[PDB]
Amino acid sequence: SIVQQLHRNSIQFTDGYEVKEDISVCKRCIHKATNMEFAVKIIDKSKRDPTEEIEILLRYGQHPNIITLKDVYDDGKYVYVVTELMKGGELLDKILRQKFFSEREASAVLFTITKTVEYLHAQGVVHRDLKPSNILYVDESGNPESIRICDFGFAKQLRAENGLLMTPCYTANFVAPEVLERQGYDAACDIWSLGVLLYTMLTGYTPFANGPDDTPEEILARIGSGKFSLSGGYWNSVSDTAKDLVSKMLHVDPHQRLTAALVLRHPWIVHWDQLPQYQLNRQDAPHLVKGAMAATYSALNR
Numbered sequence: 001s002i003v004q005q006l007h008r009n010s011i012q013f014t015d016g017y018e019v020k021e022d023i024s025v026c027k028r029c030i031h032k033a034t035n036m037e038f039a040v041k042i043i044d045k046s047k048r049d050p051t052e053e054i055e056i057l058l059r060y061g062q063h064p065n066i067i068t069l070k071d072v073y074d075d076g077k078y079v080y081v082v083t084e085l086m087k088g089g090e091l092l093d094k095i096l097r098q099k100f101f102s103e104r105e106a107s108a109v110l111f112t113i114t115k116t117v118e119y120l121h122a123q124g125v126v127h128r129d130l131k132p133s134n135i136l137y138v139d140e141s142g143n144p145e146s147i148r149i150c151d152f153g154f155a156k157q158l159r160a161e162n163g164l165l166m167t168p169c170y171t172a173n174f175v176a177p178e179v180l181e182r183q184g185y186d187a188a189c190d191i192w193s194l195g196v197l198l199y200t201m202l203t204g205y206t207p208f209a210n211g212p213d214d215t216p217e218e219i220l221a222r223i224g225s226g227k228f229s230l231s232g233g234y235w236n237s238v239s240d241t242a243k244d245l246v247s248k249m250l251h252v253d254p255h256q257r258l259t260a261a262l263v264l265r266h267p268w269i270v271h272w273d274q275l276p277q278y279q280l281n282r283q284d285a286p287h288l289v290k291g292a293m294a295a296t297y298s299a300l301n302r
């Protein structure tokens with residue numbers, strides 16, 4: 001059993017920071033030393049125990065497009081995770097509110113986000129919650145470089161029976177089959193969530209939900225063998241190639257579903273320059289989509 005080096009020190013969190021309003025619970029804080037603002041996720045050690053989460057942030061937070069860990073504190077009761085504060089709002093939210101947005105931009109956004117997940121998968125890490133509310137802009141520059149994946153609270157590292165850290169490529173140590181099994185699903189679910197992101201970006205509405213009032217039963221009935229709709233209406237002006245990527249990302253059978261690696265090799269991603277640069281015809285109800293998203297993931301987690 002190796003030592004876990006965490007918390008238990010002199011300087012408290014309150015000493016170096018001051019807590020502003022809300023944004024486990026998230027709140028905007030300020031570093032009173034430099035007067036710089038950050039975000040602090042307060043976790044209840046009597047509930048979660050975010051040892052798995054903090055490990056990922058420390059190790060992978062270096063990634064440009066992954067929310068960066070700026071500090072961490074432990075008072076013995078609660079765990080304080082200080083990260084960079086997202087000033088650009090929700091990615092999908094902002095995009096849907098742009099009257100002028102095209103596939104060329106949609107492919108560049110998904111590329112940056114998928115390239116990020118391909119890295120996490122290769123290190124044996126699965127987010128397991130990819131919903132759009134966790135993908136945010138650090139700033140308003142509008143560039144995909146300002147994109148950040150956030151809230152790894154449900155994230156998981158691949159480990160062997162020994163407790164060792166494992167990567168998908170190196171199999172030489174024993175890992176419980178059902179662990180490798182779930183690891184498969186969890187990785188496929190991440191791509192599925194990204195499939196829901198692309199579908200909404202293109203059309204302007206969610207595939208399995210209309211609005212927040214949709215019953216979980218019907219939402220799950222759709223998500224089930226039930227097939228989504230890639231044609232007519234908002235799909236008429238959408239490129240045929242783009243429709244192909246969406247169907248394979250949302251494929252009902254996980255084993256037939258596309259992998260982050262393959263997604264990046266898709267002509268839609270590979271040849272972006274072929275894609276249309278003109279504004280997409282979409283529904284504008286960003287707030288309604290918000291309700292649909294929450295409702296969709298509420299049925300999943302219940």
Ligand SMILES: *[C@@H](c1ccc2[nH]ncc2c1)[C@@H](C#N)C(N)=O
Nearest residue numbers: 023026039041084085086150151
């Ligand atoms: C709250 C949260 C934590 C840190 C942040 N930095 N900028 C915005 C936020 C928001 C949670 C959500 N949503 C989360 N853990 O991401």
Ligand code: NA
Nearest residue numbers: 061063066068
């Ligand atoms: Na980062």
